[PDB]
Amino acid sequence: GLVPLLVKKRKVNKIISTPATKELCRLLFNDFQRIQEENNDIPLYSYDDIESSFEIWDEIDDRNTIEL
Amino acid sequence: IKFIGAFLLEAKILITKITFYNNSSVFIETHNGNYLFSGDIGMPDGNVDYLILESTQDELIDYIERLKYTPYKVFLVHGEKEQREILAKRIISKKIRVELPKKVVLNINTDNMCNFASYRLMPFSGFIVEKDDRIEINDKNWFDMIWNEEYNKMRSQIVAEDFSTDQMALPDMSHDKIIENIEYLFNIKILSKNRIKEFWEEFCKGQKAAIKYITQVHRKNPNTGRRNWNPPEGDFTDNEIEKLYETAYNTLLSLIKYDKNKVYNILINFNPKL
Amino acid sequence: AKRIISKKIRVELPENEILIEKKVVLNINTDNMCNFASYRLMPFSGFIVEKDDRIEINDKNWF
Amino acid sequence: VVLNINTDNMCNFASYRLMPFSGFIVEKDDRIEINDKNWFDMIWNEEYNKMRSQIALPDMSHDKIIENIEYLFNIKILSKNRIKEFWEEFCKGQKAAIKYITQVHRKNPNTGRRNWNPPEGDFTDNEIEKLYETAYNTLLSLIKYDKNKVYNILINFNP
Amino acid sequence: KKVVLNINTDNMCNFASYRLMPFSGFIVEKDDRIEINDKNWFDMIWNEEYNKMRSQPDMSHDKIIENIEYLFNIKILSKNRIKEFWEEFCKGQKAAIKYITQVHRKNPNTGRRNWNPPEGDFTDNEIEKLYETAYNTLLSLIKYDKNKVYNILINFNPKL
Amino acid sequence: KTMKKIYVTMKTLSPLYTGEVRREDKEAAQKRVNFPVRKTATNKVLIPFKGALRSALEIMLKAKGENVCDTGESRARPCGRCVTCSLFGSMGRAGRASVDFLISNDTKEQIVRESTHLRIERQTKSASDTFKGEEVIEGATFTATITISNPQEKDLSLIQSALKFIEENGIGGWLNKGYGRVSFEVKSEDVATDRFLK
Amino acid sequence: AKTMKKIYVTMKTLSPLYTGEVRREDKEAAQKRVNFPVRKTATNKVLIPFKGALRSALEIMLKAKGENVCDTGESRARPCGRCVTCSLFGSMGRAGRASVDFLISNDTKEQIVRESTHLRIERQTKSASDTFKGEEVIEGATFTATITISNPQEKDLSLIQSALKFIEENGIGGWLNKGYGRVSFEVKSEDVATDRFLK
Amino acid sequence: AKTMKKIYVTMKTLSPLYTGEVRREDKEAAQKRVNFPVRKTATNKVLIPFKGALRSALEIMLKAKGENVCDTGESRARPCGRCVTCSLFGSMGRAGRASVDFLISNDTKEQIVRESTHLRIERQTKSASDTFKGEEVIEGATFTATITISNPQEKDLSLIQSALKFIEENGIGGWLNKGYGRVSFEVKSEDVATDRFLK
């Protein structure tokens, strides 16, 4: 729930999750920003921040060792 | 710990809030873990981390299963090849790690694997280099790299027909014309001390090497259009700069014909070191 | 946390240290080395084994 | 002791005959064979397959190679960068060098083009592809020779 | 046809059941021998061939005393300078002029003379004037006689 | 004695390209990209900066009639009697201004993006060539410091004029195509030379 | 004395670093490929001359503070003997108490040294008029030294650490106006006893 | 007496090494090319004086420790003949007990000695004001000496090894304040008898 804010402050360089986590977070993040604007509380990030978060989002599944 | 016998630890206690307890055992607490050299049995009510346990059965498992906060590793000692192995198998069954007892070794190779005979392993033929502080384990592409390095240095050390008596048809202009031209081309910065020095260096390695040097400095590259002479200092026009470069070529090529003593005695009036 | 302590496991609850260090043992002869391009090098043909806490390079005799 | 190295490429430094070498002294049964970099690559593959197990080039003459390379360097098909990359892939091995020249000469079925630099000067399409095939054949025929002769051929066109 | 191996065969490894070592050297040919000599041999032969190619006015008698006293005090004429000047004087008189011209030779690219710089706060024209004074003083000394050149240079460099 | 400390902050208003100078990095990248960016081993982006300021002031001061030499023509020897030879250097006497490399404030994976460029035939309107090159995004912040050793008066003014020239023309490469349009911000201070001595 | 100050310096490059080759054989056997070699050891590490940078830093700084430090940078200058730079780094009579090591790298020249291509661009053609190659040390490369003051005075760490900030803002060696040689220093000082090997 | 401790020292250069040529003929015939030639044999191997380094190391450390040792380094300063450095290395009366050989290299000049450019750079205008050529022994050259103590009064090997640790930290040879001369010794002692050669 705080990945696009780290993308905003440019503190994160890769965002690894499962593919289902990527596709679900492309619903949760948009819904969080929709709620933040509709509840009239200064938005924690923006839709641009969500899109840039999915620009730096790599996906890997279960039992697949990445060497980083 | 160092399993010399008689163990060791780092103070170099040869076997730090130490406390003894009846083995019916030394509890060496350090900031890097609280060791417990159990000794021989035939227990601290606190934090253990490493249990150096002398195996020489069920009684050892009983001893282990009364220490609060079960140990991270249990170094097994004072037993034969089978005894420390069978106790080890039993302790692995109780979900406790066993351990049956300089320059860093930095492996710089791939990570492909296998699951061979319960021993995750990978076949590697390679090289082991020993830098002062480390012993790197690198693959054959590194060896190909250093081979290309040594080949592309070793073929640049004998240029052939060098330091050897052979052979020409080089031009001709008098000793006073060579002196005048070298004077003019040293005042304008075309013939320099570095140029004269390198010409003498490639002249000692034969007349042919000096011809190759001079045709390498006079080659107008067909792409860029730049000879490798130092450009003249002044306000000469382009045709005049071309004529000055041609005069430099002809003067140095004519000086190649003269014997080595004359070339030296001409070229130490303009660059004293060769 | 109390029940995990009862099962003999250390608990650090978020209100509060062994130096684990995976090492790489060499386990192959290093006496006969050579120098070619200012590198103390040696060709080997062996097996890289991945144990827990320890990655061992082990010669063909091990295999 | 036995020399398994071609004794060609012998220069003349001072009153001596020399050849710059870089190789392996294998010893076996007092033969003490001074081999090359090509024996060891084979012997390395032998051990690599042993560990991992238990778990036709056209002959153009030297003058033809030099003439075709000189023409193809002047119509700007063989560039200095091309000659350097062919030298790198020849250093990596003969099979890699055939693979590189095949990669460069391959007419992509979709675009209809090859990775050679186009001929400078006015030609026809048939002449242009003939010059491309000459580049392919000349460099493939260069793979056939040894490393020292390929170096001596290519150093007079890209130092 | 006889092959001689002049590489040390001690530091030899073992791979593929074969003893081997990567060697980096030169194959040399003679009228009776084909030898394998290391880079050190090529260094010896190269330096041997390069060495083979290489083997082919008027002032007073007291004005000079006061001048050399001043230039010794301000550290531009020193015992080293006087020693080299006497060594070139023993080699003759034109060689002393040659040495003194080489020391006074201002390099046109840097504007420097091989004299020692003076001690104290001097302007650049004053330093150039002291350079000229050293040149003229020793050039005037090349016109005196040997015993006299000894008697003036002693009190400054007593060793030579 | 004092020293000028001109801190410059540069925000890219356009895609930026500076080609990688290191041959090993260029060879390693040139199996994927055809045009790598100049990248630090700390994964930051390094633009050259002294040559741009020197070329900017040389081109500008040659138009004002001021006696400035050319250090851009082939093997030209700098004069030593010009303002550009004072602030950037001559053969003897180094330049008084130590100009630092423009290092990014952010990493390669946040500001550098692979891009696809084309060559379109003029009569069939079809892509004849395709080349991938890396480019620095619009918004990336690059910080450099200029350290003038013996500060004169017009040094800050001429450095700022050179920065306005680079703001117009550009930094890096591919400048004819619209790459390298950047904005510079300047904060200068006169620090003491003995300010590290306690 | 009975004590010796040992300053263990760890330097990390923040910019490409170039310090050029001094060994004429090695320079003439590397200017066949790279026009600007870096000075390297024969153990294939990288040397950087450190003492003269420290002496230059303290000389420039302490001539500006107003102390009586002499200049040993002007041609054939005699070090006086009566300043702090002459006490620490050496006069003609006395030797300097600070024995500055070189900045030898921790890594070898295949992990730290890269060959770059620099240019000279014509101003009215906006194109290359010269091309040269150069060797350089990467960013984030680690070099180590040890200054060893033999008769330790009090203001002898605070001077060697004040010079080490001057060699952070200016540069350590080579093309320091183009942007090279920007580094960071880390000091772990210690005052050992002189007889620490006897015991 | 009846035995002789035979210390066998092997030294590797961890930094460039310089010890100057002592021979006036060899020096003056080298000033044509190199301003600072190194000490070399007529067998083209490099000599380093070793005894004085060992004696300086032990005298400095033993004065520091609190033991009573003479200073045979000052002008018009005689040895004592009662100190332990006067027993190990000698006095104006009794001879020394350790016969410290020279540190002779295992290679020739053409493989360890390189000419090197050295500079003096002006502090203001940051440009070279002087240039000179020195010779230097490369890093990784191995030198070998042989200390031989007659009448081996125990504590000899410990004192010699402590002095070698001092020389390892400080340096052997010249230009020891610039980073030159940093070494690494390797002792291999023994106690072979005096009568050993008698067949």
Ligand SMILES: [Zn+2]
């Ligand atoms: Zn100028």
Ligand SMILES: [Zn+2]
């Ligand atoms: Zn002073």
Ligand SMILES: [Zn+2]
């Ligand atoms: Zn004594």
